């Protein structure tokens, strides 16, 4: 997926791997490497008016 990865302060428990949100969107993930909790946020977008 595409997004802006930034540091996270989620209090993940050791068994927990995948984060989630109100409506089935993974806003956090655990590295399959040296452990580090990381956030996921899509980059900027908007509409255009002329």
């Amino acid at each position: 997926g595409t997004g802006v990865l930034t540091e996270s302060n989620k209090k993940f428990l050791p068994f927990q791997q995948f984060g989630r949100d109100i409506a089935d969107t993974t806003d956090a993930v655990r590295d399959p490497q040296t452990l580090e909790i990381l956030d996921i946020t899509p980059c900027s977008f908007g509409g255009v008016s002329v």
Partner: protein, 48 residues
């Protein structure tokens, strides 16, 4: 602010507030804002 002995102080605007609103209007807005929020239009800065 003398009108035949009538008192309109609770509905006329007062310049002692940043929002030029009457007392009853402030009560109404406070009652409705239980779910109305005072957000900043939720810009792209929502990345906390």
């Amino acid at each position: 602010k003398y009108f035949g002995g009538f008192n309109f102080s609770q509905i006329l605007p007062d310049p002692s507030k940043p929002s030029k609103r009457s007392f009853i209007e402030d009560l109404l807005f406070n009652k409705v804002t239980l779910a109305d929020a005072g957000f900043i239009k939720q810009y792209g800065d929502c990345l906390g």
